[model samples]
Target: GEIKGRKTLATPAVRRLAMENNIKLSEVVGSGKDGRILKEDILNYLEKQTLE
Candidate 1:
């Protein structure tokens, strides 16, 4: 059996931002090195959410 969970490349600050904004990291596409999530990624995600 294999355990499944969403994985994301992000720092503590990024994680905190996601938690605060209620954003799902798995849904945000990373533009950083090795697909690491950055602040801009979260910002973009939020902007898209607002527009939608």
Candidate 2:
């Protein structure tokens, strides 16, 4: 999970959790510093989706 040559800022727990689940941080919209995806952000996202 990375961009052209960079990556999104996220906690290790959140990063792993994001990947381990059906959803990923890349699919999320960060509202943290310089666009860093936060913990609750992932929750809000995953807690609001259906099976793909």
Candidate 3:
């Protein structure tokens, strides 16, 4: 699948946050250059954090 927007260039932190928050990083759309993960991406992914 082709990732639209800058959601593919997420950073390591973003990926980690997504995993820690139980968020599907693949589902998140990065906003960084070339989809470079950014801190905000992590924060945003965290917003969708789930409780298990």
Candidate 4:
């Protein structure tokens, strides 16, 4: 129903955004509807780098 070991829900652009930057999508926590990851989620994740 949600992200798996090699599966996660996100827009293609968002996926590319992570890929181009060399970050793992699965490492980010999606905050969008139906467990979808948005660009905003990436922004949040970037800001939260201090936590991890």
Query: Highest lDDT, which number?
Result: 4
- For model 3, give the 10-residue run with minimal summed lDDT: 1-10
TM-scores, all candidates, are: 0.65, 0.59, 0.45, 0.65
- Tens-digit per-residue lDDT, 1-52, candidate 1: 3436577777877877877878777767674456468877888787776432
Over 4 Å off in model 3, which ranges?
1-8, 31-35, 48-52
Q: Which runs of model 2 end up more than 4 angstroms from their true locations?
A: 1-6, 31-35, 50-52
Residues 1-52 of candidate 2 have per-residue lDDT tens digits of 3455235677778878877775656667675466468877887788876447
Candidate 4 local lDDT, 1-51, one digit each (tens): 454577668777787788776678888777445657887788887667744
What is the C-alpha local distance difference test score of candidate 4? Answer: 0.73
Cα error, candidate 1, residue 23 (Å): 1.1
RMSD of each: 5.0, 4.2, 5.4, 4.4
lDDT for each residue of candidate 3 in 5-39, tens digit (9 for 90 to 100): 43446556666666786666656646445755566
Candidate 4 runs further than 4 Å off = 1-4, 31-35, 50-52
State each model's CA lDDT, in order. 0.72, 0.69, 0.60, 0.73
